[PDB]
Amino acid sequence: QQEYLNNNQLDCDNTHNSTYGNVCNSVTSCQSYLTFKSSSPEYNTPSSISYLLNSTPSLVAKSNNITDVTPIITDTMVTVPVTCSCSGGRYQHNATYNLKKTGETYFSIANNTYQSLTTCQALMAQNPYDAKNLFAGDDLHVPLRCACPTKKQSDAGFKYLLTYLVSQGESPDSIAEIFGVDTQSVLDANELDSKSVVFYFTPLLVPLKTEPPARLQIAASP
């Protein structure tokens, strides 16, 4: 289990513990998965998505049953295999981001560019620049959100945790159905209960018994 971000990432003066990253509470490194919605024209191939998220094109291709050069229609969700490791008491997967235009902010980078796979709080904690003093060309250390299964999760047969980007209209039930897991395990993974509200544009951990479905668009259809 990890705390649910609960929209605390949308206010960069908020200092809730969850915003600094999942907590290192199990094995210190593991295989994990992110998700990402194809964004045209900058982040819609295995090469560009892997560049942003520091995966590899072959890993993205294999995970989604495409080739390493197959373009991906805008707004399609793809799985992104990554290594998740402990650093400074947190689980994260490291990437690097060079700002493209002055006017980008820790918030726009975390929320828009990285689609809530990181938070402005973790970016600020792990980079030297003041929020009001960022410019094109600055290179940021990006701590992407991932975790490794706890002992309790592992004993239940969960081999991986996947960071899932929630879209408008989904629920813990509909997301669990995509992956063939029970809704209660999704709730447990995020320290939520059956009445908890889950927001769109906020990530949610999904425990997996096996590799995720290769094409999520069809898994997500009713």
Ligand X SMILES: CC(=O)N[C@@H]1[C@@H](O)[C@H](O[C@@H]2O[C@H](CO)[C@@H](O[C@@H]3O[C@H](CO)[C@@H](O[C@@H]4O[C@H](CO)[C@@H](O[C@@H]5O[C@H](CO)[C@@H](O[C@@H]6O[C@H](CO)[C@@H](O[C@@H]7O[C@H](CO)[C@@H](O[C@@H]8O[C@H](CO)[C@@H](O)[C@H](O)[C@H]8NC(C)=O)[C@H](O)[C@H]7NC(C)=O)[C@H](O)[C@H]6NC(C)=O)[C@H](O)[C@H]5NC(C)=O)[C@H](O)[C@H]4NC(C)=O)[C@H](O)[C@H]3NC(C)=O)[C@H](O)[C@H]2NC(C)=O)[C@@H](CO)O[C@H]1O
Ligand Y SMILES: *[C@@H]1O[C@H](CO)[C@@H](O[C@@H]2O[C@H](CO)[C@@H](O)[C@H](O)[C@H]2NC(C)=O)[C@H](O)[C@H]1NC(C)=O
Ligand Z SMILES: *[C@@H]1O[C@H](CO[C@@H]2O[C@@H](C)[C@@H](O)[C@@H](O)[C@@H]2O)[C@@H](O[C@@H]2O[C@H](CO)[C@@H](O[C@@H]3O[C@H](CO[C@H]4O[C@H](CO)[C@@H](O)[C@H](O)[C@@H]4O)[C@@H](O)[C@H](O[C@H]4O[C@H](CO)[C@@H](O)[C@H](O)[C@@H]4O)[C@@H]3O)[C@H](O)[C@H]2NC(C)=O)[C@H](O)[C@H]1NC(C)=O
Ligand U SMILES: *[C@@H]1O[C@H](CO)[C@@H](O[C@@H]2O[C@H](CO)[C@@H](O[C@@H]3O[C@H](CO)[C@@H](O)[C@H](O)[C@@H]3O)[C@H](O)[C@H]2NC(C)=O)[C@H](O)[C@H]1NC(C)=O
Instruction: Point out which residues bind ligand U (CB under 6 A).
Output: 65, 214
Gyration radius of the chain over CA positions: 16
Task: Give the CA angle between residues 68, 163, 213 to the nearest 5°.
Answer: 55
Question: At 137, which helix (H) or strand (E)?
Answer: none
Report how far residue 5's alpha carbon sits from residue 134's, in angstroms, rounded to the nearest whole number.
25
Verify binding: residue 103, ligand Y, rule CB under 6 A. Answer: no
Query: At 124, phi and psi to the nearest 5?
Result: -65, -35
E strands present in the chain:
29-37, 77-87, 90-98, 139-144, 160-165, 203-208
Verify binding: residue 39, ligand Z, rule CB under 6 A. Answer: no
Distance from the Cα of residue 35 to its chain's centroid: 6
Report how far residue 180's alpha carbon sits from residue 207's, in angstroms, rounded to the nearest whole number.
10
Min separation Cβ 156 and ligand Z, Å: 17
Min separation Cβ 144 and ligand Y, Å: 10
Among 7, 76, 83, 94, binds ligand X (CB under 6 A): 7
Nearer to ligand U, 159 or 215 (CB): 215
Tracing tokens 């290594």 back to the chain, one arrives at 83
Verify binding: residue 30, ligand X, rule CB under 6 A. Answer: no
Considering only residues 115 through 134, tell me which ones interact with ligand X, judged by CB under 6 A: 120, 131-134
Among 69, 151, 200, 217, binds ligand X (CB under 6 A): 200
From ligand U, ligand X, ligand Z, none, which one binds at residue 197 (CB under 5 to 8 Å depending on kind)?
A: ligand X
Min separation Cβ 198 and ligand X, Å: 4
Min separation Cβ 66 and ligand X, Å: 27
Contact residues for ligand X, defined by CB under 6 A? 7, 10-12, 105-107, 120, 131-134, 166, 168-171, 197-201
